[PDB]
Amino acid sequence: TTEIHPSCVTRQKVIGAGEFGEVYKGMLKEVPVAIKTLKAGYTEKQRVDFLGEAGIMGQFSHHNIIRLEGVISKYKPMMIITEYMENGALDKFLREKDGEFSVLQLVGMLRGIAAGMKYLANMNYVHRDLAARNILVNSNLVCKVSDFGLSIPIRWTAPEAISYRKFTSASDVWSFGIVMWEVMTYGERPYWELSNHEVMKAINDGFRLPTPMDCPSAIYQLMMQCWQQERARRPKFADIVSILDKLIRAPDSLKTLADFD
Numbered sequence: 001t002t003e004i005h006p007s008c009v010t011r012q013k014v015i016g017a018g019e020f021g022e023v024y025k026g027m028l029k030e031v032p033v034a035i036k037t038l039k040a041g042y043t044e045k046q047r048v049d050f051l052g053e054a055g056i057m058g059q060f061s062h063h064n065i066i067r068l069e070g071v072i073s074k075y076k077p078m079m080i081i082t083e084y085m086e087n088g089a090l091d092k093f094l095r096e097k098d099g100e101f102s103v104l105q106l107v108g109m110l111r112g113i114a115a116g117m118k119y120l121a122n123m124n125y126v127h128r129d130l131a132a133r134n135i136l137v138n139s140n141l142v143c144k145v146s147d148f149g150l151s152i153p154i155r156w157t158a159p160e161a162i163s164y165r166k167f168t169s170a171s172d173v174w175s176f177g178i179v180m181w182e183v184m185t186y187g188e189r190p191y192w193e194l195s196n197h198e199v200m201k202a203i204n205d206g207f208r209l210p211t212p213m214d215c216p217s218a219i220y221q222l223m224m225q226c227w228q229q230e231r232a233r234r235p236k237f238a239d240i241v242s243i244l245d246k247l248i249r250a251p252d253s254l255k256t257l258a259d260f261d
């Protein structure tokens, strides 16, 4: 991992509380960055998670995964320095921009998330916490996976993972279907409505999230396939990216809307 000298880093404003201590926006040798710190007295476990997270991110090289600029490990507090994402978290972004994008733009955002997720699944990582709040958005409208999930958000979690803790790339596919629904609704809360216990009961009875307004048939059909009770009947991320690519290349296909009620 690139080791960054602290003289090349400037914290400018706290922007978050974070898993490890404060998160800042700042400037780097100048490019704006986000800066995650590990405050003093951190534990061995915390150090292994903090620098372990940075270790995987630096190795990764995909357009839809947050870019790591480097780490500060020689000096304290330790720092993880990532590209700054101008539009912030996807869930908050969509809720502040209700109705402002075209269906083609919405589907392009989902394609990027699917590609990024695919890269993670092929590299043998299970996210476990795939939700719009864990995707960031830049000034090109590109969505990149962050957080990295857990090493349990009920409303985003697949039935087999709730019921017996089987987290796989197929339960991430379930979560991705929820993310599709979050994007298509501009950040509605899944199952708005229902208690956590009622969601778990509803999912196992075959209930599913309803059709969003202005949602293409193909898009609602795909998220419904992501929500197959049986893991093996869910599409792979490769299948998902491929389908979304065909829809994006023939944009009139997105003009056929699933009925809304």
Ligand SMILES: O=C(O)c1ccc(Nc2ncc3c(n2)-c2ccc(Cl)cc2C(c2c(F)cccc2F)=NC3)cc1
Pocket (backbone or CB within 6 Å): 015, 016, 017, 018, 019, 023, 034, 036, 082, 083, 084, 085, 086, 087, 088, 089, 092, 133, 134, 135, 136, 146, 147, 148
């Ligand atoms: O609302 C705005 O105006 C706004 C908010 C944020 C940004 N830009 C930005 N860019 C990169 C990061 C963050 N924020 C950021 C900020 C705070 C915290 Cl607590 C976490 C992160 C994270 C993060 C992460 F590590 C795991 C999971 C989710 C994350 F969001 N990643 C770097 C721009 C505008």
